[PDB]
Design a protein around this ligand. Structure first.
Ligand SMILES: [Zn+2]
Ligand SMILES: [Zn+2]
Ligand SMILES: [Zn+2]
Ligand SMILES: [Zn+2]
Ligand SMILES: [Zn+2]
Ligand SMILES: [Zn+2]
Ligand SMILES: [Zn+2]
Ligand SMILES: [Zn+2]
Ligand SMILES: [Zn+2]
Lengths: 254, 254, 254
């Protein structure tokens, strides 16, 4: 384990901690190290579950790094987007039991990792909000992430949240079903362990087949047109009008 | 704007008011004027959102005009049904932000317009009920409208509501998620404006792409078999047994 | 009516009572008699609705009889599974109004019958739990049953419940929408009759077309690959590793 941008720690439970300050942005390095490390954990027969969390409280993950997609060549965008898809595909289809101990704000990209988990626990910190606010950035959530959201909080709620780019604070996220539980910040990790222990009481093979059964359609919808999705992101992101608002948004970030 | 059956009024917000008393029935004239007017509003770059409402409080819309489909020739039915599909397709796929200020009873057809909106606000008048009660009329909601309903209140609730032809009063409609908000009658229009203002804080292009993304599948399911849907309505509606109950239902309306 | 494993009793309402103690297991005999009897009721123009229930309070149905699928030849498994599909297809697609008066525990298979009904009423007995706990048995709910569950309590809830094999007691089942109503045990049957009476106020033809419309996609997904589903069950069930856990589970049942 590189243990550079993501620390992997540790019965049958491993913890992956985002270590990419200031805001655990999803850089290409990060996306790459995450998948590679996730794979080692999956082939490690002694690991049955994984808890995802930020090593630094405050921000779970700010999501994609806008810089990775500004003033770059098409080949890079293609490579980049493929890595984002990969991250989603590997998490969403993982045979491990995944639990998000959301100990910080988790907008857009950060929210996708949480959405791929089998259970989501959030810190009762009013400053922490989770949701897909792409629309506000002049961007739009990819169809597959959208389906993942729909499968989580319902089609109607997703329709409103995605268009308004809604970011839900703890109580609201719980009410809409975006998170499954809200506990005081200091209990988030221990609760993740409690819940994890329960999932471990489930025979691995049948749990995994059930999970696979629940998600194949959603994943397959992406896998069958992966190249087309990459081409579309490259086209859309390369547009001067969109490249532009990607600058005004970055500058306002100063 | 004809401003005959539908009044179009008026920053970036236009209001379309049903003006087809006694019950704002969805006559062919009405369906036709509505689409034509809606189109002018969509190509009017100064209009970003539209609030739908009855110019006369009490009845939002009674839905289709049963007379338009009794003792008519197949060619008429085909033409009629095509206009109903059109009304749904244009509203459901509109790039404008649509908000229903439901200031009256809104059964069947009236409910479809509300279901196509991006947000639904209803007057807290116990006499106002909204829902798809086709089954009671011996009729059945079209598959696409059914999918729209399913996407709104869930498959299970829709299954019950559509079979029982349930009409929900304010509190109930809110509880099932059919409407997003319930306010005192006199505040319905102002609230529609408040909410609308918020949606306007969302960059138009990304909001529109998101919306389009959420609804294409549903709409496309109709577009790919539009002619077949028209043929089916014509067959089903032309049946003597169904034409019959369409008389006993009309007579009881005296 | 054989009236051996299932008693058929009786305006326009018939009652089918599971009579296969000790636990109303879904034996092949039972599955066969149920379908045959259900068919007589459907072709009996004087019967419009059917209430399902256990003649013996305590256990609605324990679901499939594990013995029917241990140490058997492939031809039997194929025959068996075809009968399970049949039971689901006939109930799910029935033109009759089906109401489950759940007067006992209803795990796995028992839960499938309840899920196929148009309305579910449960006895307020804390000892009664309903849900699909296949995963715990080292088994997994078939895709079609999974879709039926998803259509009932939502995709997210189903994902959790199916993986954890959750069994919901009355209050919990009501909260998740698995059951539509919870009444004191002694009122279950009378309530089933009350509700049934209401569904009868709905014109049969339009109710049936609506229902058919709501469920064809789900059913058709199975019908188009029925043989493949049978082959898969036979393969999966025949595996020595799965045949094994099917013994350790049976032995622990002593
Ligand atoms: Zn590159
Ligand atoms: Zn800790
Ligand atoms: Zn610690
Ligand atoms: Zn005509
Ligand atoms: Zn007004
Ligand atoms: Zn006014
Ligand atoms: Zn046999
Ligand atoms: Zn009784
Ligand atoms: Zn009795």
């Amino acid at each position: 384990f590189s243990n550079k941008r993501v620390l992997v720690e540790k019965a049958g439970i491993a913890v992956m901690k985002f270590k990419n300050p200031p805001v655990n942005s999803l850089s290409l390095e990060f996306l790459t190290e995450f998948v590679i490390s996730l794979e080692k954990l999956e082939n490690d027969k002694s690991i049955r579950g994984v808890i995802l969390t930020s090593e630094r409280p405050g921000i779970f993950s700010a999501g994609l790094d806008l810089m990775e997609m500004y003033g770059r060549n098409p080949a890079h965008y293609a490579e980049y987007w493929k890595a984002v898809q990969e991250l989603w595909l590997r998490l969403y289809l993982s045979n491990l039991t995944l639990i998000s101990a959301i100990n910080g704000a988790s907008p857009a990209g950060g929210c996708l990792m949480a959405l791929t988990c089998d259970y989501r626990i959030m810190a009762d910190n009013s400053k922490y909000t989770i949701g897909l606010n792409e629309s506000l950035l002049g961007i739009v959530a990819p169809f597959w992430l959208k389906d993942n959201y729909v499968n989580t909080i319902g089609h109607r709620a997703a329709e409103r949240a995605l268009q308004l780019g809604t970011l839900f604070p703890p109580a609201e996220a719980l009410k809409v079903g975006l998170v499954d539980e809200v506990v005081p910040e200091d209990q988030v990790h221990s609760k993740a362990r409690s819940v994890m222990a329960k999932w471990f009481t489930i025979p691995d093979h049948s749990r995994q087949l059930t999970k696979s059964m629940m998600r194949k359609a959603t994943a397959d919808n992406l896998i069958k047109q992966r190249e087309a999705d990459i081409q579309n992101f490259t086209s859309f992101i390369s547009r001067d009008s969109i490249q532009k608002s990607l600058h005004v948004y970055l500058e306002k970030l100063k």
